[PDB]
């Protein structure tokens, strides 16, 4: 097994500013696919043990 | 003939009552369905 990691879309891209999150919702599902891919790694890391 | 016919009859009763044994093949449909449904929602967002 490897080290299980998780990446937040809000805290990494935006500095908790109101102008960053308004243009982030126009980009949509770009970090939704990247969040659920790392979730699907962390399920399979427990299945390897 | 009592042991082999009763053991194969429990396989037929398990697949009819419980569909969870085929759920590994149901994910192969579900990994293809969630990939196509996310890809067709890219046109609604304005990309900046």
From Swiss-Prot, chain A:
Top-level division of the source organism's lineage: Viruses
Disulfide links within the chain: 9-31, 14-20
Function statement: Precursor of the fusion protein processed in the biosynthesis of the S protein and the formation of virus particle. Mediates fusion of the virion and cellular membranes by functioning as a class I viral fusion protein. Contains two viral fusion peptides that are unmasked after cleavage. The S2/S2' cleavage occurs during virus entry at the cell membrane by host TMPRSS2 or during endocytosis by host CSTL.
Name of this chain's protein: Spike protein S2
Lineage of origin: Viruses, Riboviria, Orthornavirae, Pisuviricota, Pisoniviricetes
Gene from which this protein is expressed: S
Parent-protein start and end of this portion: 730 to 778 of 1273
């Amino acid at each position: 097994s490897m080290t299980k990691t998780s990446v937040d879309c809000t805290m990494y891209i935006c500095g908790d500013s109101t102008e960053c999150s308004n243009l982030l919702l126009q980009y949509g599902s770009f970090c939704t696919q990247l969040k659920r891919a790392l979730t699907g790694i962390a399920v399979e890391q427990d299945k390897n043990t | 003939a009592n042991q082999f016919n009763s053991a194969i009859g429990k396989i037929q009763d398990s697949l009819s009552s419980t569909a969870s044994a085929l759920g590994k093949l149901q994910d192969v449909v579900n990994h293809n369905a969630q990939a196509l449904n996310t890809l067709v929602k890219q046109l609604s967002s304005k990309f900046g």
